[PDB]
Design a protein around this motif. Sequence first.
Motif, PDB file in Angstrom:
ATOM      1  N   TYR A 156       0.821  -1.200   0.000  1.00 25.21           N
ATOM      2  CA  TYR A 156       0.000   0.000   0.000  1.00 25.21           C
ATOM      3  C   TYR A 156       0.860   1.257   0.000  1.00 25.21           C
ATOM      4  N   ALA A 157       1.961   1.232   0.750  1.00 27.58           N
ATOM      5  CA  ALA A 157       2.901   2.341   0.726  1.00 27.58           C
ATOM      6  C   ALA A 157       3.553   2.466  -0.636  1.00 27.58           C
ATOM      7  N   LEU A 158       3.817   1.334  -1.290  1.00 25.15           N
ATOM      8  CA  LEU A 158       4.353   1.384  -2.649  1.00 25.15           C
ATOM      9  C   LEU A 158       3.359   1.998  -3.628  1.00 25.15           C
ATOM     10  N   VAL A 159       2.074   1.678  -3.468  1.00 28.47           N
ATOM     11  CA  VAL A 159       1.038   2.207  -4.354  1.00 28.47           C
ATOM     12  C   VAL A 159       0.948   3.723  -4.238  1.00 28.47           C
ATOM     13  N   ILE A 160       0.914   4.239  -3.007  1.00 30.76           N
ATOM     14  CA  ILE A 160       0.787   5.690  -2.851  1.00 30.76           C
ATOM     15  C   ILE A 160       2.078   6.414  -3.237  1.00 30.76           C
ATOM     16  N   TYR A 161       3.236   5.800  -2.971  1.00 31.65           N
ATOM     17  CA  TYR A 161       4.531   6.325  -3.397  1.00 31.65           C
ATOM     18  C   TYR A 161       4.578   6.535  -4.909  1.00 31.65           C
ATOM     19  N   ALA A 162       4.258   5.485  -5.669  1.00 28.29           N
ATOM     20  CA  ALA A 162       4.300   5.573  -7.122  1.00 28.29           C
ATOM     21  C   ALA A 162       3.209   6.475  -7.675  1.00 28.29           C
ATOM     22  N   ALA A 163       2.048   6.530  -7.024  1.00 29.83           N
ATOM     23  CA  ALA A 163       0.964   7.355  -7.538  1.00 29.83           C
ATOM     24  C   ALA A 163       1.250   8.842  -7.374  1.00 29.83           C
ATOM     25  N   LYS A 164       1.782   9.250  -6.221  1.00 30.64           N
ATOM     26  CA  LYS A 164       2.108  10.662  -6.048  1.00 30.64           C
ATOM     27  C   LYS A 164       3.282  11.084  -6.919  1.00 30.64           C
ATOM     28  N   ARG A 165       4.248  10.188  -7.146  1.00 36.82           N
ATOM     29  CA  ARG A 165       5.321  10.531  -8.075  1.00 36.82           C
ATOM     30  C   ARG A 165       4.807  10.665  -9.508  1.00 36.82           C
TER      31      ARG A 165
ATOM     32  N   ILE B 261       7.682   5.571 -15.448  1.00 33.56           N
ATOM     33  CA  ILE B 261       8.845   6.370 -15.067  1.00 33.56           C
ATOM     34  C   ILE B 261       8.959   6.467 -13.551  1.00 33.56           C
ATOM     35  N   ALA B 262       7.823   6.576 -12.858  1.00 33.63           N
ATOM     36  CA  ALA B 262       7.827   6.649 -11.402  1.00 33.63           C
ATOM     37  C   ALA B 262       8.344   5.366 -10.778  1.00 33.63           C
ATOM     38  N   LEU B 263       7.923   4.218 -11.305  1.00 36.02           N
ATOM     39  CA  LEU B 263       8.396   2.948 -10.764  1.00 36.02           C
ATOM     40  C   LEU B 263       9.874   2.725 -11.051  1.00 36.02           C
ATOM     41  N   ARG B 264      10.362   3.162 -12.215  1.00 35.65           N
ATOM     42  CA  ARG B 264      11.798   3.064 -12.455  1.00 35.65           C
ATOM     43  C   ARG B 264      12.591   4.010 -11.564  1.00 35.65           C
ATOM     44  N   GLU B 265      12.023   5.172 -11.235  1.00 37.11           N
ATOM     45  CA  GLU B 265      12.668   6.091 -10.303  1.00 37.11           C
ATOM     46  C   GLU B 265      12.742   5.509  -8.901  1.00 37.11           C
ATOM     47  N   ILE B 266      11.684   4.819  -8.470  1.00 39.11           N
ATOM     48  CA  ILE B 266      11.693   4.168  -7.160  1.00 39.11           C
ATOM     49  C   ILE B 266      12.736   3.063  -7.126  1.00 39.11           C
ATOM     50  N   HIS B 267      12.782   2.244  -8.182  1.00 41.71           N
ATOM     51  CA  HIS B 267      13.720   1.126  -8.215  1.00 41.71           C
ATOM     52  C   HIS B 267      15.164   1.589  -8.321  1.00 41.71           C
ATOM     53  N   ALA B 268      15.415   2.710  -8.988  1.00 40.55           N
ATOM     54  CA  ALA B 268      16.775   3.212  -9.120  1.00 40.55           C
ATOM     55  C   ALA B 268      17.238   3.998  -7.906  1.00 40.55           C
ATOM     56  N   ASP B 269      16.399   4.098  -6.871  1.00 39.89           N
ATOM     57  CA  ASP B 269      16.719   4.679  -5.566  1.00 39.89           C
ATOM     58  C   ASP B 269      17.091   6.157  -5.674  1.00 39.89           C
ATOM     59  N   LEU B 270      16.138   6.946  -6.163  1.00 38.80           N
ATOM     60  CA  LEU B 270      16.315   8.382  -6.292  1.00 38.80           C
ATOM     61  C   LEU B 270      15.295   9.198  -5.522  1.00 38.80           C
ATOM     62  N   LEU B 271      14.287   8.579  -4.935  1.00 40.46           N
ATOM     63  CA  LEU B 271      13.281   9.294  -4.172  1.00 40.46           C
ATOM     64  C   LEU B 271      13.402   8.956  -2.696  1.00 40.46           C
ATOM     65  N   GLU B 272      12.654   9.690  -1.881  1.00 41.32           N
ATOM     66  CA  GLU B 272      12.520   9.346  -0.477  1.00 41.32           C
ATOM     67  C   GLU B 272      11.127   9.733  -0.016  1.00 41.32           C
ATOM     68  N   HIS B 273      10.578   8.938   0.893  1.00 44.69           N
ATOM     69  CA  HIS B 273       9.211   9.119   1.342  1.00 44.69           C
ATOM     70  C   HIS B 273       9.145   9.015   2.854  1.00 44.69           C
ATOM     71  N   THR B 274       8.137   9.662   3.431  1.00 48.23           N
ATOM     72  CA  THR B 274       7.860   9.598   4.858  1.00 48.23           C
ATOM     73  C   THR B 274       6.394   9.250   5.044  1.00 48.23           C
ATOM     74  N   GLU B 275       6.109   8.316   5.943  1.00 53.26           N
ATOM     75  CA  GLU B 275       4.736   7.882   6.139  1.00 53.26           C
ATOM     76  C   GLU B 275       3.955   8.899   6.964  1.00 53.26           C
ATOM     77  N   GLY B 276       2.646   8.691   7.033  1.00 52.45           N
ATOM     78  CA  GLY B 276       1.767   9.605   7.732  1.00 52.45           C
ATOM     79  C   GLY B 276       1.864   9.496   9.238  1.00 52.45           C
TER      80      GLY B 276
END
Lengths: 694, 225, 237, 49, 83, 578, 26, 63
Positions: free
Chosen positions: E25-34, E68-83
């Motif tokens: 679920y965290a992966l879904v919201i991560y990729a959707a907002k990106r 593109i968002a999923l490739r950005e997540i896999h290539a380790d270029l983003l960072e996220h913080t949970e609610g």
Amino acid sequence: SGLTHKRRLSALGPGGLSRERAGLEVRDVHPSHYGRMCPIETPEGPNIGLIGSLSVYARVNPFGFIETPYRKVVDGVVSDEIVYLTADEEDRHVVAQANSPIDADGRFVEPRVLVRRKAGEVEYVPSSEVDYMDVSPRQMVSVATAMIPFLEHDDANRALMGANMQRQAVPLVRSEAPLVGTGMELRAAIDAGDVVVAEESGVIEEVSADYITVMHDNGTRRTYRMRKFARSNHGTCANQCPIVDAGDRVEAGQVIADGPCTDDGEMALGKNLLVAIMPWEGHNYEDAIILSNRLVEEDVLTSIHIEEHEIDARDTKLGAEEITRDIPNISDEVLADLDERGIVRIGAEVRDGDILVGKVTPKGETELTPEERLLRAIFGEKAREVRDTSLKVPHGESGKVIGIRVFSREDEDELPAGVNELVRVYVAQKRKISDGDKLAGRHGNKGVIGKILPVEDMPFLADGTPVDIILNTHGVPRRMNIGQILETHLGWCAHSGWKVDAAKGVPDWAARLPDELLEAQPNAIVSTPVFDGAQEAELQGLLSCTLPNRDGDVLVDADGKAMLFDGRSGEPFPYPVTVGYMYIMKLHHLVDDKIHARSTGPYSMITQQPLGGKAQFGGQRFGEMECWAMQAYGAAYTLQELLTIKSDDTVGRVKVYEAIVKGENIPEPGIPESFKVLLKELQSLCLNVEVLSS
Amino acid sequence: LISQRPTLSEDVLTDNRSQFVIEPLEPGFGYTLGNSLRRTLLSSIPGAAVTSIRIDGVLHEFTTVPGVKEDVTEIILNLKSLVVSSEEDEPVTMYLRKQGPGEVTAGDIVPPAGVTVHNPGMHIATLNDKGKLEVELVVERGRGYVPAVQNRASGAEIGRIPVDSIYSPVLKVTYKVDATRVEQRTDFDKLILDVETKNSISPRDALASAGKTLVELFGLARELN
Amino acid sequence: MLISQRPTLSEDVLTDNRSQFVIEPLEPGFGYTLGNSLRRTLLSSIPGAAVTSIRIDGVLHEFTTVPGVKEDVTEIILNLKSLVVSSEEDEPVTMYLRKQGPGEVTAGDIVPPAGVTVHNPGMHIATLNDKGKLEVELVVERGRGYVPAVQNRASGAEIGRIPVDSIYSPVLKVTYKVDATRVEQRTDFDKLILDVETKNSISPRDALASAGKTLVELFGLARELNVEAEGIEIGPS
Amino acid sequence: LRVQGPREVQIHLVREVQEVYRAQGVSIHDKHIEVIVRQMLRRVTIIDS
Amino acid sequence: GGYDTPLGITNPPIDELLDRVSSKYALVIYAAKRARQINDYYNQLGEGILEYVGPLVEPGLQEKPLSIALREIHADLLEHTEG
Amino acid sequence: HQCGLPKLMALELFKPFVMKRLVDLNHAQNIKSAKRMVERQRPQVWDVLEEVIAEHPVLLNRAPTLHRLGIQAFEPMLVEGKAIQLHPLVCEAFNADFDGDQMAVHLPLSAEAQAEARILMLSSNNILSPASGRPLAMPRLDMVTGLYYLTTEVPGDTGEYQPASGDHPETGVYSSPAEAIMAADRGVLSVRAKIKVRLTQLRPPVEIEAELFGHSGWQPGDAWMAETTLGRVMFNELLPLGYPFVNKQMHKKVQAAIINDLAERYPMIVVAQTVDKLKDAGFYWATRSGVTVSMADVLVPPRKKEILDHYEERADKVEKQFQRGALNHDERNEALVEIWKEATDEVGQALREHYPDDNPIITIVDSGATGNFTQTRTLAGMKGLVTNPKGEFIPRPVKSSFREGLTVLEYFINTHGARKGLADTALRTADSGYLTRRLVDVSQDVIVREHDCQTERGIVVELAERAPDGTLIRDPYIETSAYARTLGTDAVDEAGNVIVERGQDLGDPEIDALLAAGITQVKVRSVLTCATSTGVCATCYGRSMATGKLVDIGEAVGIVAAQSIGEPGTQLTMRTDI
Amino acid sequence: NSVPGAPNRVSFAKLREPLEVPGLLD
Amino acid sequence: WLSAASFQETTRVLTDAAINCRSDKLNGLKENVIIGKLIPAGTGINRYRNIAVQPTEEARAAA
Ligand SMILES: [Mg+2]
Ligand SMILES: [Zn+2]
């Protein structure tokens, strides 16, 4: 299907029981149905047992009780006088069985006879208390169940499916008679009524494709017209073509012209196709079927379907509608096939979107937007005060235009109140077989067509003949319908012919075969009746002695199996494979009538949800169980956009459409319309439902 | 190491069916070679067949001519079994005029220069004293099976009736190998290929066309280095 | 007629001798009618040489073990069987190896006569310890395909020889599959994907070229019946 | 429940349901039945106010 | 891990995406907002550029912003913080 | 992860996307002319439609949706036709035959919805069933016949290894599976004959590995000798590189155990690719298996007349004693029913011992593909007894098999039970739907809210009760009672140390360790004792059966439980006043 | 038999039919 | 009263929720489906719905 829609005893209706409140006691087979109803043929849906069909020999009393004939046996001697007994007298007496050894005058042979007693029990009674006997076997079965060969080898569920799918077949363009059938085909054809039958004997004077005129024995003559390409109720074709010559002699009762599904007099719902029962590369996996391309090239399984379209020009409040080719703003090129007065010319091919009848309704004068006002002032056109509501051919349809039937007020035709002109256009198309179309046999083995291979990569015999369908072999043993395997073996024997060598006497499998079944030419039509047919020993003998094709080559050995090659890799298959001729028929569950799709179409009236059905555009229903599946996955956003901006958010559907078209991001949803309708109903029931804030 | 090359020789059975024998192949090669030749023969031999007919009085495929016994779609199904061999490549036309009682065969078609009709004994339609048949066909070249090219795809009038055309002059091809497999490991196959054609080309010409197609295809992998 | 779409060909190197040839876009059918022919010609119609019969002295009927070595007769036999060798003369030549003392025997130990070359000297074949004496007589001839152990033809003329199965082919494992690329405008074309793996005697490109040459002459055998017959020419590139 | 406390009605309900499914060769884990069983015994009945 | 080349919708592999996040679920919201940020960049590139930036890896010819968002997540270029 | 979508449906579904794209590629000038071009289907629209359909999942749903795997998300591709081409491995999850069944295609629009349909609901992320944890994308019936034929072993086939010596060596060994495949392409070696290959890229089983290499055989390189067939080598090349060599015969339970072990040790992408390779090889060897049904493959037993006469005498004696009057009208019914049940069992036993082991019908039954043995017994042998509209057994019985052909009275008797079964199966699906509805409505408020209630309560679990002679027999219902739930207290064995500490998942190695150490009861942690206020916690729920990890902190475990209970309706037969 | 323009369809039946089938629309 | 009325006995559930002046808090999983907002399970809880996603420091600089 026309015959078995009559002879139907529906137990539900005004004065009878309903469907929801019908108990499981009334849906069963009582043991007093023997000869008055068919235990097999019922609808398999939620109407099991509530709809039956009359038996073959049954009658109806003056009061309404269903009689059946029995032979009267007097003191161990079976006579020929036939007595019609209803269920009470059948319970009173004791009735014998039809296939019991009469001793050539009426006497029984064995001293104990299998009978049927009062309470539905079956006993072994000595041959002096017997006082009635059946007329024949297959007295219990119906008309549709009497045309299944080898019925007594099938299971009852598969016999039910076979008898229900035999009346969904479509009329093809060629209508070839079956190679192995039962006897109930000529009678079921000449009694159905779709076959022109000569009334009195005579000599044919002139045959055309429209009429036959027999010259009778006393002066007079009578011309029978034909129904040529007339639409049936369900959209098929009802062609009739003569089968006599221009100098023949006919007798009274003789078939003089075929029908839709007949061939030289007798019923023919399908074609004979060479079959193999191997599993082939997963394309026939779980009841799918692989055909050949030869059945598309040679137009074997090809049918004709005829639609009709109807528009009517009435007189509304602001004026009268007008059927004319002077349409409002439209290109010239779409008015090519239309004639000088509206309707299309006969023979013009149409396509999904074309104009069939040009009708234009009066609109009047309304408010125009300033932007359209500025565009009209730029390009100089007038307001065009009449609104175009034409008749257009709906989505997915094509084919030639057969005939235009136009009524009118001015010819004093009895149109209803208001209608000034009504015009019907018939569009016919010739559908070939394709993947998605549904085929079936006679013993309840249906299945969609998975793949149509080319004719070169099919498993061909050692002679060179490719097979035509490939049925899977995992659906035979667990479904208990080896009537199809026995029909396949006898179909190969009846195709290639046989000659039993009666040199050193008749062999002991054929001791009770009739005469002139000891030899038969190729393509010999045989017939096995329902409960008195060809035995397994006779099938083994006829399989063992057939006759070679053209050279010295017996392609199918004594087990019924052949050594197929493989048309794709080249090498022979390692083990022999069952081949033979099977009679399969094309069913009316075609793929062109079932597919629909919708992006945005019409919406409902009270609530703002989309409509439902292929007659409209129509959306799919996303119910409670699918909502539970989505919640079980955990997809919240998918559920929210399925229930708000795809059904009811009236200000949200236009915004999501313009966001998709402009390429932007999808907006957040709003409150659905049906909830606000619910709040208005609850407030209208004197309840003070108020939504708070914080 | 076997150092003998394979050789093809033809035995004739009938006038439209022969039986070729190729030997000595490598062991395991007879089935693959014969099936390659069979799959080429059954699908890519160019011939000629009638594309679209045009009868005089009729307008579409679902009507009847006054006088003839088979209606128009039955005449279409009868004309779909006509075998014609064309010479040129442009779409030629040929006519059929017949009046009065009798029986319209396929010998009554009067072909132009080049094209021929090979079975003058086929039965097309039968007529009575009030009937008349005037139908002009269109003959083209091609290969394989191609469905009915529609009227609106062309610029055709109302009277044109497109017909499914199958351009394939071969009818039934099979093969049969005979391996020796002696103890001394000097083994060979012997392909025996049987070709039957539908009276439009000789089986030698059918086999030569299939061989030319396969040579032109395997020349691609020949030109690699 | 004309093909209307010329096929291409493009190898894809995986290791030193293992490739993946693709051919696209073939007209419908024809993936199976040339994939199986290419596969069977590649496996069964390229000449090469292999070891047919061996003879180690000291073992004539005791087929269990050889004195002085670590392995046994079957391990020595299928160490010799996977030995890639070449030849020029068509008669059976004879080779030898005679390594004394403790140590390990490789395939560079054999002394090749005139004509033959051994394409991997680093293959381990046996292992000697504590004064063994290995003296094996090998027979190399040439042919095509795979042929099993031809048994004792001359019985008393050679009682110590043990014939082995021969692998004359230079290719070893060819697998193919077809697909359905670009079915849109030209009615369901094809795409054949070969996968050749050879031994290091030749390269897969040369193997494919030799198979193409023998198939071209084998089908020109049938082409030279009536040369003025119309087929399906490809034409210029 | 009245005799042997709230624990033994949780043994009894899981055991009797699982002997219907095991007779036809159907496997359900017991944690899918204990979710339903825990939702029956949430409430108490008042005897003295 | 070891596998054949993943093709189509299953690239990048999900078992290597799921080391980055806690749960699916965290992966879904991560990729959707990106993906929302990438689409706002693509509809704001002609005008002035706000804080929405990206793609941080080079896209293909016609590649969806979720891919593109999923490739950005896999290539380790983003960072996220949970609610 | 793919499904075929016909182009005429895909155009109408993706109409706004294709309108935007063919305006942006300047094939049209505006939305109105673009919509006119799409509805007239001018041939640029297919070249646009492929590029807009690339990488955009759709949801396929088949009504009724009994459980949550009835909605799955594939990635579409265009297909010339009008039928939705489905993968043959998801038909067990969808419960779909191909007798004309229909499926509905939805479409996700927003970025959140596409991410959900790509991650949560993708077809190759749901291999295991959420009820019990058994795999649902396992090969079924046709690949099972193919793999069973591929991996079975025939004694005395062609090219079998034989150690016969004195004149010649063994002549069964091979140096590589490449040489074995060449010999099988020639007419020398059968696939199912026992040989001795020399494998170099397949990892040996544990005993041979510890014997030869001991610890660390780096199986890309090392060489070892296996006395298997060639079919088992070709089967083990489909499994991954680190998986040990199986060398068994692929009954469907063995394939289920292999796929379950793969799903618990390897990533899900590796499990999906392995399942596809198994499907391909299964269909290819199912074609070459020689499975056909003819009338000579259905053999009748040769002692059926003797068995039926021997029981007919006893039935006649019972009816004669009833005519004498020593027993009433119900005792003779019970005696006749018992006699004919014994006769039915005897005929079935004679048939089973008569059929050869390589018959097509008995191969289909014995490989776990389809069917049971009672259908074979009624096909060849004896139909047996039959029911009534009331439900009692008519003591006639039906003594004819469907190969020989039933007679008129026997067929009319059999129709009672057939039609009652059809009507009962019509009613039972509505009944199961009502039960599932009520279970969903009760348990809708049980979702996972925390990670730890941090209680010390917990239930006890029976875990392999003691034997009387003295040893530990495993309890049969242990995969549905003790597996996949967290331990509550430590496990201490007969005044000893800890075997499994508190908090472990209690899987198969933990259960094996506990049973080897010899303990019988554990105190496991369950949701009946979960101490959170609203909804269960997550350590009390245990592992999720559909993933293999711990359950997440938003899962709707109540709906998953309700659908898992209510889905095995329509296979709960009543009987044949509790 | 009993229908004059009939195709000759040879039967496997071994029993004599005493009563013909009635009219199917009576 | 909104999840109970949609289940069964709609007339009886509404007619005594009206007397008690009962208030629904919309905490359920079927009340949120009816009024068309996000269900409180899965990706609709506050742990997952309020994720802030931004590029990291070293990849913001390197582009
Ligand atoms: Mg179905
Ligand atoms: Zn807890």
